[PDB]
Structure formats: C-alpha cells, structure tokens
Design a protein around this ligand. Structure first.
Ligand SMILES: COc1ccc(NC(=O)Nc2cccc(-c3ncn(C[C@@H]4CCCO4)c3-c3nc4c(N)ncnc4s3)c2)cc1
Ligand SMILES: COc1ccc(NC(=O)Nc2cccc(-c3ncn(C[C@@H]4CCCO4)c3-c3nc4c(N)ncnc4s3)c2)cc1
Lengths: 546, 546
C-alpha cells in the first residue's frame, strides 16, 4: 500500500541539525538551558520565526528580531548575554556545518529506484545573507534526487499546520495510508499520524532506517555501494557551436567553475561520461561533455581528411574561441584521449591540464610508416579491417543493438576476440545475433546509443582511424617537444587493446606526469569503474587543475 | 587596388613590445648594451629562438637554452650576470605587461568594416608556462576581430623567411600589390616590400596610422568613438534547456567566470543584449543571454497563465537547477527587469546580485486592483489595448518589419505616441507603412527580429501583460520583505514609459540600492547607449557581484 516517502531537511536529510546549534551555543557560552531555543520560538504561531518560515520576511530581516527576543529572554532569566553575542555568526556557522546525511539520501534514492514518489517537506526561510550560496549549493545537490521539494517559505504554510499536510497529499496525489513521513520533530509528525500516514521519528539515522526498511519491505541498510548519479539526456543543458560552415559541435553542459572538456572515444557519445558529469559538476567544475565530430548531434561530414588530428584539434580550439573560453582542462578516453595529448602538444596555451583514460602517448617514429607498426602487432588487426571505406560501416550499421551489446562488455563478459578480424571477415562473425546485456549497461542505455547512431552511422567515427599517414606527418612536427603542462595518465588493467604497458615510457616526454591505475577494468573505463574514475579525476583536478 | 591589411603582434597590435624588455633589463641591471638581445638571437636561423618560433620546442624548453646563451655572451663581454638573474621572471613580467594597442585595433576594425580582409602575422611560441592563460586571453580578445591569425609556431615558418610571405598571400587569396603590411621590425618588412606589398615600419602608432590612412584613403585617425563589439548569431554558442514537458528555454552563452543571466524585455530577443555580451564576457563573466518564454527559440505556449510572474520565475529557477548553477547575477530590461526584481524577492538564495535597466520596483497596493492603477495614468493606455487576446497580435504581426522599425527608435526619432491607443484603434494608426530606419539599428538587425518573430508571433510576448491580477496576488505575499542582496537600478532619462521618477521610492524597500543613470537615452537602453550601459554594468559587477 506504501508508495511515497517524505523526508524533512533539518535533522533528517542534513546533519547536524541547525536547530541543535541553539543548545550547543547555550552550553558553550554557559547560558541558561533553553534560553536560545525559547527566544527562537517566542510568540509561537504569531512570532518572528513563524513569519520567517511562512516567507513573510527574509532571514536578514529576522536576525534583529531574534536578537530582541534573546534580550527579552535573558532579562526574565536574570542573566546577561556575552559581550560579542551574534545571532548572525551563530547561524552562519550552523548552516555551513550542516552537510547531507549520506545514508538518509541513499535510502531515499533506493526507494525512488523501487518506484516510490519521494519528496522533501521542510520548514525553511528566504536566505538573503551574504553567505547564502552554501545553502543554495546544498539544496541543489539534494533536490535533484527527489520528485518534489516543498518549502514552507514558498508555500506560505508551516509544519505543524494541517494545511501543509493536505498540500503535501495533493502534491503527492496519494492518500495518507500510502505515505511514509520522516521527521526529527515529534510535534511536526503528529498531524501526519493523525491523518493516517506512517510516521518515523528520526533520532539516530540507523534506527530510523531500520523502521523505514521494516515498514517498506525494502533493503535500505547494509546495501551494496551504489553507482554515482547518472544523466537523463532530456534533463541536460544541450549546447551547439558552429566551428566552420558545414560543422557544428554539440555538447552537454553542467556546473560552474573551471571548464572541463570531456572527449569520448570510439564508437561512443557524450553519454559515455554520464557517471562523471554530475560528480565533476558537484566537485566544483563546469563540465562540457562533447559529441565528438562524426557523432550524435555533432556534424558528420563524409570526407576522410575531416577526421585527421590536425583538423579535429583546430576545431576544438575554434570551439573554445566561440564559447569565449581561453582554456579548458581536457580529459579524453580512447580516441578522445589521443586528441587531448595532441591538444597539449600543439595548443598548450589553451589546455589548462590534460588527462587520458587508457590512451597512452607514443611519439611518432620518423623512420617507420604508421601502418607498419599496426601490422607488427596482432591485437591491432581490427584497425586494418577499419581501413577500407564501407566494409566496417556495413557490419557495424547492420544491427545497432547487436553492435553496442557486443562492444560494451566488462572484462569478465566474453568481449570481442580481435585476432584475425580480416581473416574471419568481420568483428561479429563469432558473435551471437542477440548478445546478452552487460552488467555495465541497461537496455534503455543501449537504445540511447542505437538512437544516436541512427543519425550518421559509422562513417565519421571510422574516419578517425583513416588518417594514419596524415596524423604521423603532423605528429613528427612535435618530435622535439615535451608536455610540461599538468598531465594525468590513467591505465586500465584489463583493457586488452590499450594495455597499461603501452604507456610505460611516457615520462621520457612528460617528465612531471601523474598517474592513476584501475584494476579489474576493461576498455569501457567510465561505465566499468565509474566510482574509481570519479575518485581519480576529482583528486587530480583539485590538486593540479584548480 | 588595396584590399588586405596585415598586422604584426609584438610592437604593432600589442604594447609594450616583449622584445623591448631585453633592452630595459640590460639598462635596469646595468648589463652591457645589447647583451640580452644578442643572447636572444644567438645562432640566427639555426639558434634556439628560431627553433622556438618555428614550433620545434616550447617556451619552457627554450628558457634554459636562452639562459645558456646569456652565460656565453656575458663570458665573451667579460661581465657577470646578477646573483638572482631569471629569464623566466623577465619574460613572465614582459608578457603580462603587454596589452592591446587600442588605436591599432580600432584601425584594423575600421578597415575590416570598409571591406578589407585583415590578418595577424606573428613570430610566436608554444606557451606552456604556468602563467600561459594571460597570453591565451589576449590572443582570444585580438583574434576575434580578424579574418586570419597566422602564427609562426603553428605554420613551422618564420619571418623574414620568404615562404611565410608566400603562405600569407595564399591565405589572403591576394596579390602582393593589394596588401598593406605593418611591422615594427624593418628586416621582417623587407621580404613583403621585395614582393611588392605596401609596407609600414611601425615606431609610434600615430605616424604608422597616418601612413596607413594616406595609403588606404580611409579615415583611421581622429575618428568618432566606435560602438562596442556586437554578436553575429551564427558564431555564438546556443544552449537549450527543457524546464518542463512543453517548455524549453534557449540562450546564447559566452565567457567564463560568475554566471550573468541577461533577461530582455518586450517585444525583444537575446539579441537585444548584442553589445553587452562580448563586453561582459571580456570583463570576466559567463554571460547567459536568454530568449525569454514566448520568444525566439524558446517555447511559446498559448495559455495566458503560463506567463504570470510566479511561473516565469519558477522556470528560471529550474533553468539554473538543470545547468547546475547554484546562483546567477540577474540583469533585466523592461519586462525582464520586472522578472529580476521578483527573482530577488522570491529566490534570493539563487540570485547573486540583481540589476534592472529602466524597470523600477513598485510594491503592490493590497487595497487597489492593478488595472485601476493602469487606468489612472494616460501613458499606460497601450496596456489596456494589449489586454484583449488577438487584437494587438493582429496589428503587431501584420507587417513585422514595420512593427520593429516603428518600435525601435531613439528619443529624437519620433517614437510611437502612446496616448489614446484604444481610442485610435491601434499602436501604428498614425505611423507610416514604411518607417525610416533608426540610427540604433541596421536593416539586417531588423530582419533578425523579423525572422525570430515569424516562429511564434506576439501571443506569448503579449501574455506577459495579461496576468495583472495573478501577479498582484503573488506580489502581495512579498509586502513585508526587503531586497537586501546587492541591487542596481539604472534609469533612462528619456524613457517616457518607464520614467526615472517611477523609481524614486525604491530605497524604502531596497536600502542599500546602488544606481546608474543614462542621459539622452530612450526606452531601448542597450542599443541606444551601449557604451554607457557596458560601463555602468561592468563597474557594478566588479564591485558588487565578483
Ligand atoms: C572493436 O571496437 C573497438 C572500439 C574501440 C577501440 N579502440 C581503439 O582502437 N583505440 C585507439 C585509439 C587511438 C589510437 C589507438 C592505437 N592503436 C594502435 N596504436 C599504435 C601505436 C603505435 C606504436 C604502438 O602503438 C594506436 C596509437 N596511435 C597513435 C598515434 N596516432 N599517435 C600517438 N600514439 C598513438 S598510439 C587505438 C578498438 C576496438
Ligand atoms: C509599444 O511598445 C512597447 C514596448 C515596451 C513597453 N514596455 C512596457 O510596457 N514596460 C513595462 C514592463 C513591466 C511593467 C510595466 C508597468 N507599466 C505600468 N506599471 C504600473 C505601475 C503600478 C503603479 C505605478 O506603475 C508597470 C508595473 N508593473 C509592476 C508590477 N506588476 N509589479 C511591480 N512593479 C510594477 S511597475 C511596464 C511598452 C510599449
């Protein structure tokens, strides 16, 4: 019968409770017990605090009124408030110290994953303090995970008034018996109970979650570590820049701070960074997740030479110019990782820092043709298969769902055996018509890639491999250079195409190179090990990129 | 015969010349005259500096080589270099001190305006220093104003090599006699002259521009103050956010730094901010120029209530949520100015600072109907004309070019007389069928507005005026509040609709309100006085918004 879960903010989704700081202050300043809490609730439904919680006045208008109540209370109690007593200081510190209650958020996230409608119902204020951004940032992080956020100061009603509960029920489109309501204030829980809602008085989080698990029949405690937050394509800001007459680049954009340009590989999408986008934005960065040239909503001209590294890099520099960005940190994976090393070598003034997942930096051999190197290693046979225009396109485009389900597999999921691809006559000749779904992806996520690839197919993406000679000639111009800007190389233990050992000599050309290494990780780094990718990238960004 | 102008960077488009710092350093450290300049050019075409200028090595690889040449030169000269002599420090300071030569840039801008192809040809380096962003920012500001930027380190050729001149001519698609080439180095001018180009040796800017004016036949010196840089719609980054199922918001985005959300008025576009967008981005802000709901590429649902302030504000808060922005500075003009005051009153935690052009903040009268106030003032008669759905739409949509040419007029250009609009039967009844073009706009800029309005017409825009009662009821909830966040009110002397005196009591509700005032400025503030709007906004942003 239960299908909705409602959470309070202070003392439930965020700890320590801002309210509990009035008690801590009394103790720290040796004031009479309850003095501050009494001045706070002074006047009850007609008092200054209710006016604040209903949105009649702002927090900065409330501060002097709370101070006057504090003076009145101290007078009656026959005590003196200290020399430099400040309600502003006390509240600034309390609000700043209040952080998200991670296990409570995890429980809300699990209930919503299981089909519950979730909401935050809170008695809050209109915050106009100079330091208001901290609270704004917290409310943003929290709210994205819920169906509804109901704030007393916006609705002009306050808990425990019965009208706010009828408003919640109307917002939820649910009858009281269908709702679990969690609150740390027993008085605010009473009208929900009186209406017939399941109520949980929250003291310690663990007990509250045990009651929540018992009543919902859903495992919320001791659960496995969840995946980082992903992206819903229709909820993102989509950006479009024309870099030249027939070429436009599409990107997804989230967050504020230093620009972080994410560059996917083959045959991928901006969506390959879905687990990184929210995390990097939350870490204090402005994420620009590209659809590389030839992919998704970006233009896909047919000509091979439109996909040589020199032109791709020139376009990424134009992309920055048109957005008015002097620099970006460039993070690439696979072919994207190759491009980012080239951006660092040719346009260091535009590259704040550079990081590559899997793709090593190997200097060009000015004596050997690049095709000779590919022929020497049996693992790179698929690249010769990719050479003849039309051959790989026909195979990869034949059945899109089959293509992505065969490609996107974890290291233990029987990934494509790429030896003798040319001899066999294709990539999927020993592959099932209907592959099983990898643990890394949902059916819906595969259908997103299928839909994206319906627009342009595989011509542009395969063209990235068709400029060996052109790329070699351009790379030779960089032979006397070193990469001296901040650089990170992330190796994936079980990537059998871009093996960790291929990166071993990078320090000869990148002396200050920093590294990351991910164990039990295949080629599809971002979706294989998203938590670890996020951990490595955020740590390096905060230390080396600002 | 002349149709192309080529400019050097160091000593021509940027001053003081980075090269002249070697001489200043010798003088300041009392080193033998020419010692540093000699170590700099040591080895000539085979030396370290040519390798740097050709892109063989980066600036950070060059620094130790220059230091070794400095040691060799001092040895031969029988002198000692000082205790803490640093080539890095010297160059960091020289590059940072180098600023754009504004009169040279103005001359290039005028020549391009008159149909010249313009280019920058420069001997430069691959900058990987920790402080490289300063130079990146300068190159970005400069390059946008030119057809081509040719950098020695990217082309692998250097002035005075004849190949770079043949490459320039091929890039320009011009014969030498058609080209003016300006350089501060006589040796680098010689091959252009030998090819038959018009050459100008640049010492002082004034003399160089007198020679340039004489040879081109174009007034470049003593010219009137130019307009700020505008926007070419096809060169901007275009962003799109779905705020709810049937509503998407479009915006143009430029720059990095604190988010600045520009909100246009009626019946306008993001393009109404064209002179502000480049200037604010250059000032160190991330500009988000909206197409407000009902306009341009943003959705335009037909329902009146979709355009009440409460819903418009809720959507702008959702817009911030989806972009991952905790706050933005909100700057509005006209109806946009009305919305920004409402954002400050209802969502102060999301508003970094608020500024309005022309639109005052007038608290709601809880005793009088908003329609009663409009009827009391004859100037607001056009608002009653705007009430009946369909009437104003038919008149404004009849001839789009006529609508915008009649509307967009400076204070001295016989703007619409809005008295007895209802009695007359319309806005344009006493207006010509073919209005003259205002000095504020080009024919092309009018056709941009015409094209934008072809999509949705005037229904959504007029609906902003159709929520008087709803807006009044919502505004009454804010009657006990004050705006205590940073606020700027900009009045326009000759706006006869939004008169400066209408803002006179704003300090009663916004005690710390800052002001700007623009004389001889009509209603269309941004295009009437763009230089002054930019000056007022940048000054206030830098002082009050970060
Ligand atoms: C079947 O589905 C797939 C999907 C993705 C891939 N991934 C790739 O093919 N990744 C990729 C991306 C970019 C370059 C390479 C690559 N594969 C082989 N080499 C050859 C080098 C040369 C000597 C040692 O290995 C390179 C590289 N190309 C370059 C280059 N052009 N410049 C610099 N370093 C390298 S490494 C691979 C493979 C199969
Ligand atoms: C014919 O082409 C045009 C193009 C643009 C305009 N511009 C406007 O109509 N601007 C505009 C925008 C927003 C509000 C108003 C406005 N016009 C009259 N009042 C009435 C006030 C009330 C008492 C004194 O004047 C208001 C305002 N509406 C509000 C509101 N709803 N809330 C708060 N303050 C105001 S001022 C005007 C006019 C003709």
């Amino acid at each position: 019968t239960l299908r909705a879960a409602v959470f309070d903010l202070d003392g439930v989704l965020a700890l320590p409770a801002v309210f509990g700081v009035l008690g801590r202050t009394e103790e720290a300043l040796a004031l009479p017990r309850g003095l501050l809490n009494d001045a706070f609730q002074k006047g009850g439904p007609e008092g200054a605090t209710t006016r604040l919680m209903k949105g009649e006045i702002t927090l900065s208008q409330w501060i002097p009124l709370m101070e006057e109540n504090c003076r009145k209370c101290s007078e009656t109690a026959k005590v003196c408030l200290p020399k430099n007593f400040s309600i502003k200081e006390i509240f600034d510190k309390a609000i700043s110290a209040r952080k998200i209650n991670r296990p409570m958020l995890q429980a809300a996230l699990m209930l919503r994953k299981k089909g519950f409608t979730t909401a935050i119902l809170t008695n809050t204020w209109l915050d106009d303090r100079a330091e208001r951004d901290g609270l704004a940032q917290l409310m943003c992080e929290l709210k994205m995970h819920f169906d509804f956020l109901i704030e007393s100061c916006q609705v002009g009603m306050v808990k425990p008034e019965p009208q706010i509960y009828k408003f919640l029920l109307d917002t939820l489109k649910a009858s009281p018996s269908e709702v679990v309501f969690l609150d740390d204030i027993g008085a605010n829980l009473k009208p929900a109970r009186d209406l017939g809602m399941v109520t949980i008085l929250v003291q310690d989080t663990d007990t509250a979650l045990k009651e929540l698990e018992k009543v919902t029949g859903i495992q919320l405690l001791n659960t496995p570590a969840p995946l980082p937050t992903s992206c819903n394509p229709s909820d993102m800001s989509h950006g479009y820049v024309t870099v030249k007459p027939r070429v436009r680049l599409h990107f997804v954009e989230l967050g504020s701070g230093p620009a972080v340009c994410l560059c996917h590989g083959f045959p991928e999408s901006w969506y390959s960074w879905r687990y990184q986008i929210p995390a990097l934005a939350q870490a204090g960065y402005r994420v620009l997740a590209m659809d590389m040239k030839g992919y998704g909503e970006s233009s896909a001209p047919p000509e091979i030479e439109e996909y040589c590294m020199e032109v791709l890099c020139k376009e990424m520099v134009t992309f920055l110019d048109k957005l008015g960005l002097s620099q970006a940190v460039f993070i690439g994976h696979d072919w994207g990782g190759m491009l980012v090393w080239y951006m660092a070598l040719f346009y260091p003034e535009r590259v704040r820092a550079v990081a590559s997942l899997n793709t090593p930096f190997i200097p060009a051999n000015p004596n050997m043709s690049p095709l000779e190197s590919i022929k020497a290693n049996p693992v790179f046979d698929y690249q010769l298969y990719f050479q003849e225009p039309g051959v790989a396109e026909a195979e990869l485009e034949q059945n899109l769902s089959r293509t992505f389900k065969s490609l996107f597999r974890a290291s233990d999921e029987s990934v494509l055996s790429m030896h003798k691809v040319c001899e066999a006559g294709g990539l999927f000749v020993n592959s099932p018509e209907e592959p099983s779904l990898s643990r890394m992806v949902t059916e819906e996520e595969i259908q997103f890639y299928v839909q994206q690839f319906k627009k342009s197919g595989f011509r542009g993406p395969l063209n990235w491999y068709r400029n060996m000679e052109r790329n070699w000639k351009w790379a030779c111009k960089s032979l006397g250079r070193k990469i001296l800007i901040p650089a990170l190389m992330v190796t994936a233990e079980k990537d059998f195409v871009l093996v960790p050992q291929m990166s071993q000599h990078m320090e000869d050309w990148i002396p200050h190179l920093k590294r990351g290494h991910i164990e039990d990780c295949g080629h599809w780094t971002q979706m294989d090990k998203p938590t670890e990718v996020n951990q490595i990238l955020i740590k390096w960004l905060d230390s080396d990129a600002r």
